[PDB]
Write a protein that binds this ligand. Structure first.
Ligand SMILES: CC(=O)Nc1ccc(Nc2ccc(S(C)(=O)=O)cc2[N+](=O)[O-])cc1
Ligand SMILES: CC(=O)Nc1ccc(Nc2ccc(S(C)(=O)=O)cc2[N+](=O)[O-])cc1
Lengths: 446, 446
């Protein structure tokens, strides 16, 4: 009964109080740091095999953000873990009022496949920092990374506290019968409901980082040269397989073709004339997803790319024009290198378009006008927002990353990770003295 | 069917953007303030009929805390709602980084019966302040308060935005099929799982204020006169029907009888020789609960009280001695005026006793030694903690109130209510100019 054994062993190890001193956690974190350094080439190998990442983007688009998180947490831990004194009242002057931070217990992190290292290990850094045992369940789709982590994690980190669980849906389903103190899951909206249903049975709090279609509004009087380069970058990295990728563009029909053009120009700079020959361009994860993505290109007006190779699972950077909001490519998260352009004739119409759909993980807008930015923000709802750039808003330690509605609940990154994986316990400490002022509360009343 | 209409009307009213300006929210809150003043005697009448509260404790043990919350929120709203600037990095100097607060949408508050006004309206204050539509579902067990709120709420507050839903389990069950943006529920652990299961279907975030047995540890060398007075107060108010009532006592067998004695002494001061003749002493809510509470007194060593009257649903303040941890009275939340005393022979044994059970909403300890206080806190887990008092820790605006594990998830009160009923949206605003520092990210890579 291996799953149950790993969980039981993790719980027992947590109960012994081993994780409580900050020294212990900082050292596990320092062990992770060494893992990342000593296994750099193996990590690159795994990412290359799974997603056709090269050595540069394997580091600068995934791994390096784990390191920065580790470095930041090690540094801020004593301050975060310290009891937090709070505002008193005229009646609680003599009292101590503070918030006490403590671990939840055993935490489950369920990873996903598009960034199989980062989206497994970054949440773990937080949960470790917060003093929890952490059970890991990597995605099977990132087969090479899943198998590597199961090997190297126990080589560096405490064996009982941080077990890795292998498998897929059947194994995952069985893991969710075990009692956890917190569950963090990154993946799809549909599975989020399953995680939550399973969590309810033990009243387990959850953090769900889910999906949706992240809109990208482009304004008329803005510099499209800068805009389209940034959009193309965030859209086409990892072959479009990014939760906060700009999924589609909204723009006035008068600027459509210029956008198409400036995108091509930027794409050619990134990946050359043929993207299949670029070491910087990725591949689709699985055969099933390759076909899903191809099927969305059908019956569409292609302005660029449009072709794919089933063997190596390559899809050329594709731009679609005059796209029908009801067509398949606009009815699901694309998660591939296909960028539809939908026309709207005003800011107000773009806002309405966004609000009639489920709330996205990210919302993007490009504009020189501060008032256009402020209005779209005030009148929409999304997990997070970036104006005049993409992706970057989820890499800053001071901005919590998370969804809302269908794109998720809860958040992590930086201090938020510590908070998410802790219980914040309200404490009141009074002196035990006969206080004559408190005698009014006691019966009988006058 | 008319449940569906109320929700739809509430959603449409929220969609119109009516709740967004702070002016509107403050107005609704000022209307609630008016309600509490103009309906003071009707509220007292309802609480007297349901729980045998008198006019003094109806106000000072319930209603006054709604008022303080309203006054505090009105005052702090502009500050809380304001965009919150966050720490920058050397690379985001030119940028704007802030957290934007926005309503979730339509909020459901499901109330409970023991404090049928406070535990319905206090959460509502927060959800209103945060700019949501708020659907209310009062507990049917507090039949008089449930029926009153359905009458008076629409007289003072916006009719579409803040509907009251009448009924019980069947009506509640049907309400949970509707799509909400947040659900707050106060009640039992068992029903919490149902709420959460229903919430998963729409990925609705939940705040669960649940139950458990709140322990009260009494140390050997502390002044038992002050201790037992405070314990008896918190234990026996509202006839023991309090989520954060000290449920049982843990103490060394050497101080047991003194405790029993000092409790009697305090009880006699509160409610006279016969508590049935005191207008300050409450009654059990329902016939079903009266019997539940009586059945827990059986086969137990009674040291005081022990008798009850089925007609008026009165149970005398009861103290049980040398109680077996395995007996019924120690295997469920008492929620009645029956105080068991369980013997432990050390602090370490008390800690172990607490940790082997489900996590309680509150943990109480009485001691002159701060090192004993600090140790029990560090080595246990509970929703909140009070040392050398009871109840009071959940009445301070700066201490979030909520559970952990089986005692619940999430929290509210003060600023936390505002946060809980909002989405905290991370915003990054960059200038749309050229940035040569950004060039390093674009392919082709080194
Ligand atoms: C900031 C920058 O220049 N480049 C850059 C490149 C890649 C990333 N990574 C990155 C991008 C998106 C996502 S997600 C959650 O939307 O799938 C996750 C990561 N991640 O954590 O690895 C983050 C930043
Ligand atoms: C602070 C003080 O002296 N007395 C005092 C007396 C009564 C209360 N009320 C009070 C006590 C407990 C609970 S609960 C959630 O545990 O059921 C709720 C309320 N309530 O309705 O606000 C709060 C404070």
């Amino acid at each position: 009964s291996k799953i149950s054994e790993a969980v039981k062993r993790a719980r027992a190890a947590f109960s012994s109080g081993r994780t409580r001193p900050l020294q212990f956690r900082i050292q596990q974190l320092e062990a992770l740091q060494r893992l990342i350094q000593e296994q750099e080439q193996e990590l690159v190998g795994a990412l290359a095999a799974d997603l056709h990442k090269n050595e540069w983007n394997a580091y600068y688009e995934e791994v390096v953000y784990v390191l920065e998180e580790i470095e930041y947490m090690i540094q801020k831990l004593p301050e975060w873990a310290a009891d937090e004194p709070v505002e008193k009242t005229p009646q609680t002057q003599q009292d101590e009022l503070y918030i006490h931070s403590e671990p939840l217990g055993v935490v489950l992190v369920i990873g996903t496949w598009n960034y199989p290292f980062n989206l497994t290990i970054q949440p773990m850094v937080g949960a470790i920092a917060a003093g929890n045992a952490v059970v890991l369940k990597p995605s099977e789709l990132s087969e090479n990374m899943a198998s590597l982590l199961a090997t190297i994690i126990p080589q560096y980190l405490d064996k009982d506290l941080y077990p890795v669980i292998n498998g897929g849906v059947p194994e995952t389903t069985e893991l969710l019968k075990e009692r956890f103190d917190h569950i963090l899951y990154t993946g799809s909206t549909g599975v989020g409901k399953i995680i939550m249903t399973a969590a309810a049975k033990h009243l387990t709090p959850v953090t769900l980082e889910l999906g949706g279609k992240s809109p990208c509004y482009v304004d008329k009087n803005c510099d499209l040269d800068v805009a389209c380069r940034r959009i193309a970058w965030g859209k086409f990295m990892n072959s479009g397989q990014t939760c906060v990728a700009p999924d589609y563009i909204l723009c006035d029909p008068s600027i459509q073709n210029q956008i198409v053009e400036k995108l091509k120009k930027s794409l050619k700079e990134f990946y050359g004339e043929d993207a299949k020959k670029s070491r910087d361009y990725g591949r689709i994860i699985s055969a099933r997803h390759f076909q899903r993505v191809m099927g969305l290109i059908e019956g569409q007006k292609v302005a660029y790319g449009g072709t794919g190779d089933a063997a190596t699972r390559y899809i050329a950077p594709t731009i679609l024009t005059d796209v029908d909001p009801q067509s398949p490519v606009m009815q699901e998260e694309i998660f591939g290198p296909v960028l539809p352009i939908v026309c709207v004739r005003s800011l107000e119409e773009a806002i309405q378009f966004i609000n009639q759909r489920e709330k996205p993980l990210a919302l993007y807008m490009f504009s020189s006008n501060d008032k256009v930015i402020k209005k779209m923000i005030a009148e929409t709802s999304s997990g997070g927002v970036a104006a005049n750039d993409v992706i970057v808003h989820i890499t800053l330690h001071s901005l919590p990353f998370g969804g809302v509605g269908n794109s998720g609940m809860g958040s992590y990154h930086g201090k938020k990770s510590f908070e998410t994986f802790s219980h914040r316990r309200s404490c009141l400490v009074r002196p035990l003295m006969n206080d004559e002022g408190l005698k009014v509360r006691y019966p009988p009343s006058p």
